[PDB]
Design an enzyme around this catalytic site. Structure first.
Site, mmCIF file in Angstrom:
data_model
loop_
_atom_site.group_PDB
_atom_site.id
_atom_site.type_symbol
_atom_site.label_atom_id
_atom_site.label_comp_id
_atom_site.label_asym_id
_atom_site.label_seq_id
_atom_site.Cartn_x
_atom_site.Cartn_y
_atom_site.Cartn_z
ATOM 1 N N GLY A 1 -10.664 37.361 -34.286
ATOM 2 C CA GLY A 1 -9.683 36.456 -34.856
ATOM 3 C C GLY A 1 -8.736 35.902 -33.809
ATOM 4 O O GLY A 1 -9.025 35.972 -32.615
ATOM 5 N N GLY A 2 -7.598 35.367 -34.246
ATOM 6 C CA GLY A 2 -6.638 34.797 -33.312
ATOM 7 C C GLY A 2 -6.206 35.763 -32.230
ATOM 8 O O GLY A 2 -5.679 35.347 -31.204
ATOM 9 N N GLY B 1 -17.740 12.518 -3.628
ATOM 10 C CA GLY B 1 -16.607 13.149 -4.279
ATOM 11 C C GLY B 1 -16.560 14.657 -4.164
ATOM 12 O O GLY B 1 -15.475 15.235 -4.075
ATOM 13 N N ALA B 2 -17.726 15.297 -4.169
ATOM 14 C CA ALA B 2 -17.797 16.751 -4.058
ATOM 15 C C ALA B 2 -17.115 17.220 -2.776
ATOM 16 O O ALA B 2 -16.427 18.239 -2.775
ATOM 17 C CB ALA B 2 -19.252 17.205 -4.087
#
Lengths: 353, 168, 176, 176
Positions: free
Chosen positions: A5-6, A242-243
């Site tokens: 759960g949360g 870009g890498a």
């Protein structure tokens, strides 16, 4: 054990999460609710077991074989970090012997002659760290990139490195997010970061684009540009487009950038480059397209697929013999450890999410 | 070869020799004629043995004005780096009079700015060893821009990190 | 989506108003494997990190963790309002009664499926409302829906001068 | 004179406008022996130290070091303008051609003094203007002289909110 759960959001916000194989599970929704709502059948282990969270979800940083091993991993983690952000990581000073050792020499021949033949980046990392000891984090997640801790002259350092042995070492969504949070973790806690680069580019794929590589890949750039801890980068072999910029380049703020003679720093591959640069000269005299292109490609490789143009412009501080990497890192950290740097005042940044 | 790892390493060695021996022979000798040392020997005198780490050893100018592009010596006329003096951190630059008469250009200006920023960033002194005929005329206004960038650093670093000028 | 938006508002001093009607998290194997644990936690971080004025209004559904995530007072919301139609609880009645009364059906399951309906009805009329949250001050007031604009206007007038800060740090380490 | 004035303006938050037309430094043994090296450096320090808005306009002459000293962009000027009549260069054409073509006259000096005039003319029409500086962004724009007031007014409107600082220190060590 269970974290359902949360409740799972608490560990999620913490810096590192360690799970135990087959005896720990994390999940927002259980298999039962999933079955009744989506009709899909899934087991507890497959859904949120330790292996799943260490190799698929990117939630856990380590999967231990048992509880005792998990606790030891936690102690190791703590040993590389300070007690709080006001102090530098705990250090047990020890002067390194910088004479070139037989091990150092091994680096001169670790890079294969063939461009497509990989090597284990783990070996490069270990050769610069004290006792050749590398404490890896998230080893099962995004294997194409390596993250972890080590020490240099007794002082903790963080490591980020492309792994050409896995998926060609290309940058993808998972590798970018893995490395990005690790760099920010190091930076927030005053740990220097050492980056080893050998990246061919980004992983191609419609899935990568549709899943948000644009916003998720940018997290790594943000991490390096934001860092104020010492940053030393070494390019072992490939550094295209870009890498190259993303992997701790000087343009983002890296303090010392080194490159081996085997480094190939270029805007893109030779073949892809010539098709653009020479589309007209190849149109004309089509009687020799394949001959003219092959000749143009070879010249482009021999002229620009190296680190000397980057060196001419100071993008890399020095081109070094591989065997001298440990010396440069040791002497580099000695001078950079007094680094003082700050970003513009702000409540906080707005990193892509 | 050149297409093998071994060949690439051998290639670096060749470039290193060229870089460490930039400046024409009929210049390095004339300097020696006077009671002067080379730009590199001066750095050796200052820094503790084995502590010198050179930066931008293979930098090359990007000018094409007045045939300056006929020769692009590695280092572009100034030797820069970091090291220690009596065990303490120091940043240094040493102008090479044997290269283009030591005339200061764009890349040569940028190398000095890099060491200056390194010094400010890490908080250590800067020792500058000067021996230059003046601005590199061929580069035109680019040379003046370089000076300007250095002056700005001198001013911002004033009273922050010690700056010592050795004029030889 | 909401996480980055909140951080954007906060960085640039823009107050954030949150309206809540969430039944929970979307179930799905893909959600888990895709990292809902680390990605969903981004919203919690954004609200807890925010220092700009925060006013939250729960119209209707507010169950479990989702309730906490949607600008709850527990994260630092300054004024939390709820309409009478709000249902603030740990989970749905059905899923609750199954647990809370699991051992009290298993006994003589014969003629017991029909009785579940009654216990479920009791849980809904007793807890699926905003009054238990109001008793504890989790919500500052239960208001008439038509009174929402008034509460927001008067609230922002007072919260406009809000001054708050987080512990000193180079930066946080939000899940990525 | 200019150095202290600039520092006065800067200390008291007054923007500084600089108009440039300088052929160089005044030659003279007295200038050297009196300390032009340390005293002239005061102006550079004042401009580089300034954090108030700085707008510079080069009307006409801007040679060598003097160009750098007179509120150049390299020192931190925020907006640098130049009229078409501006001449931004390392030095005068005559002094330039003598160097740049020293070895290409010494050969057969006979019937060569007249040809110097042509090479000098080429240097002036090619470099004694503000366009090379503009190609490199040393000057933000080459403007019509009559457009100067507009540029200064609009410039100050935007630069009025300038915020900048120098590295932390007790004080600087300006040449005295």
């Amino acid at each position: 054990g269970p974290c359902a759960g949360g409740a799972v959001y608490s560990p999620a916000i913490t810096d590192f999460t360690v799970m135990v194989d087959q005896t720990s599970h994390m999940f927002i929704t259980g298999p039962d609710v999933i079955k009744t709502v989506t009709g899909e059948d899934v087991g507890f282990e497959e859904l949120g077991g330790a292996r799943t969270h260490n190799s698929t979800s990117g939630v856990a940083h380590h999967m231990a074989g048992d509880e005792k091993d998990a606790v030891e991993y936690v102690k190791q983690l703590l040993s590389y970090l300070p007690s709080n952000n006001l102090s530098e990581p705990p250090a047990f000073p020890e002067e390194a012997d910088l004479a070139v050792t037989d091990e150092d020499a091994e680096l001169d021949t670790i890079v294969p002659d063939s461009a497509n033949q990989p090597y284990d980046m783990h070996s490069v990392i270990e050769h610069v760290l004290d006792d050749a000891e590398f404490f890896e984090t998230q080893p099962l997640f995004a294997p194409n990139i390596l993250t972890g801790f080590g020490r240099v002259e007794g002082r903790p350092v963080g490591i980020v490195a492309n792994q050409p042995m896995q998926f060609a070492g290309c940058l993808d969504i998972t590798a970018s997010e893995k490395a990005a949070r690790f760099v920010r973790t190091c930076d927030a806690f005053n740990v220097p970061v050492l980056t080893f680069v050998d990246v061919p580019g980004f992983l191609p794929g419609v899935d990568q684009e549709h899943d948000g590589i644009i916003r998720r890949g940018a997290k790594l750039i943000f991490a390096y540009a934001e860092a104020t801890v010492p940053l030393i980068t070494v390019i072992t072999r490939k550094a295209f487009g870009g890498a190259y910029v993303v992997m701790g380049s000087k343009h983002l703020g890296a303090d010392l950038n080194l490159a081996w003679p085997t480094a190939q720093i270029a805007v893109m591959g030779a073949q892809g480059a010539v098709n653009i640069l020479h589309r007209r000269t190849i149109a004309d005299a089509g009687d020799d397209a394949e001959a003219t292109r092959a000749r143009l490609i070879q010249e482009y490789e021999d002229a620009l697929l190296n680190p000397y143009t980057a060196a001419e412009r100071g993008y890399v501080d020095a081109v070094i013999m591989p065997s001298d990497t440990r010396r440069h890192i040791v002497r580099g950290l000695r001078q950079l450890r007094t680094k003082r740097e700050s970003l513009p005042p702000k409540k906080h940044g707005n990193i892509p999410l | 070869d050149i297409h093998t790892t071994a060949g690439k390493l051998a290639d670096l060695r060749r470039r290193i020799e060229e870089a460490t021996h930039a400046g024409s022979a009929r210049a390095v000798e004339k300097q020696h004629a006077k009671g002067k040392l080379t730009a590199r020997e001066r750095i050796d005198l200052l820094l503790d043995e084995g502590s010198f780490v050179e930066l931008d050893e293979f930098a090359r100018h990007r000018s094409t004005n007045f045939g300056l592009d006929a020769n692009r010596p590695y280092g572009d006329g100034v030797v820069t780096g970091y090291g220690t003096v009596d065990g303490r951190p120091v940043a240094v630059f040493s102008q090479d009079f044997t290269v283009f008469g030591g005339a200061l250009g764009e890349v040569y200006g940028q190398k000095i700015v890099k060491v200056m920023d390194f010094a400010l960033k890490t908080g250590c002194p800067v020792v500058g060893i000067n021996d230059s005929g003046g601005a590199r005329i061929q580069e035109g206004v680019a040379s003046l821009g370089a000076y300007g960038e250095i002056f700005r650093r001198n001013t911002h670093a004033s009273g922050v990190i010690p700056q010592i000028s050795l004029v030889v």
